[PDB]
């Protein structure tokens, strides 16, 4: 199911966090990975293996995982951080299964 | 007192467990998902 807040609010310069929750079979056992999706384009990888960050994403973004929940901290929030953020988590119920979160519409107050 | 709950769980986890009987001894068949990482051949 990977429930996460339907949307989030933030004004520039304030650290804000997106959080996702799931059972022990998907986020408890495996590693989450967050996917940004700027409006009007296709989603692109943001965070993989819950900490690491691909070549291109600023240190501005970070990920974390506590037990059965994962959190995406967007520090130094800027205007171009307005998008939908999804989290995926390979689940062990079947031999191949992932679960995408509902998505979180992050706006930039102002 | 975060340690109290951890120790309680660890002590209670093994109450009545018979380690001579595989899980699902008569109900199911134990599926074991194996995996190997060969550090050096």
């Amino acid at each position: 199911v990977l429930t996460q807040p339907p949307s989030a609010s933030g004004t520039p310069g304030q650290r804000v966090t997106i959080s996702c929750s799931g059972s022990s079979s998907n986020i408890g056992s495996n590693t989450v990975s967050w996917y940004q999706q700027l409006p009007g384009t296709a989603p692109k990888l943001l965070i993989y293996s819950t900490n690491q960050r691909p070549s291109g994403v600023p240190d501005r973004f970070s990920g974390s995982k506590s037990g059965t929940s994962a959190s995406l901290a967007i520090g130094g929030l800027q205007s171009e951080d307005e998008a939908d953020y999804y989290c995926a988590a390979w689940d062990d119920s079947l031999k191949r299964l992932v679960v995408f979160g509902g998505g979180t519409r992050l706006t930039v107050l102002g | 007192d975060n340690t109290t709950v951890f120790t309680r769980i660890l002590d209670r986890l093994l109450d009545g467990y018979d380690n001579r009987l595989r899980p699902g001894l008569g109900e199911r068949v134990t599926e074991v998902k194996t995996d190997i990482f060969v550090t050096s051949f």
Partner: protein, 92 residues
């Protein structure tokens, strides 16, 4: 249930079991049947006058103390229980 049912079955079998006594201690001899699945004969060394062989050495006997009726299925127990039973003192 089934799992517990068997748990009490095995516990009852092992409670009051004297490992020091062979099957039918006061009675007729116990008959042990043996198999060998020779997995490999590795090295036949003429200098050491020896050879090496890996095998699956199996024995089978009757232990009326280890009899149960309340389940039909063939029981397979964790090897650590072989310490609590009587096993023949075979040696090569």
């Amino acid at each position: 249930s089934n799992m517990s049912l068997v748990k009490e079955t095995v516990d009852r079998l092992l409670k009051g079991y004297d490992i020091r006594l062979r099957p039918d201690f006061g009675g007729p001899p116990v008959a042990v049947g043996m198999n060998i699945d020779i997995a490999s004969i590795d090295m036949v060394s003429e200098v050491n006058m020896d050879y090496t062989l890996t095998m699956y050495f199996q024995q089978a006997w009757r232990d009326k103390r280890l009899s149960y009726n309340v389940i039909p299925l063939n029981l397979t127990l964790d090897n650590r229980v072989a310490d609590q039973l009587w096993v023949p003192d075979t040696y090569f």
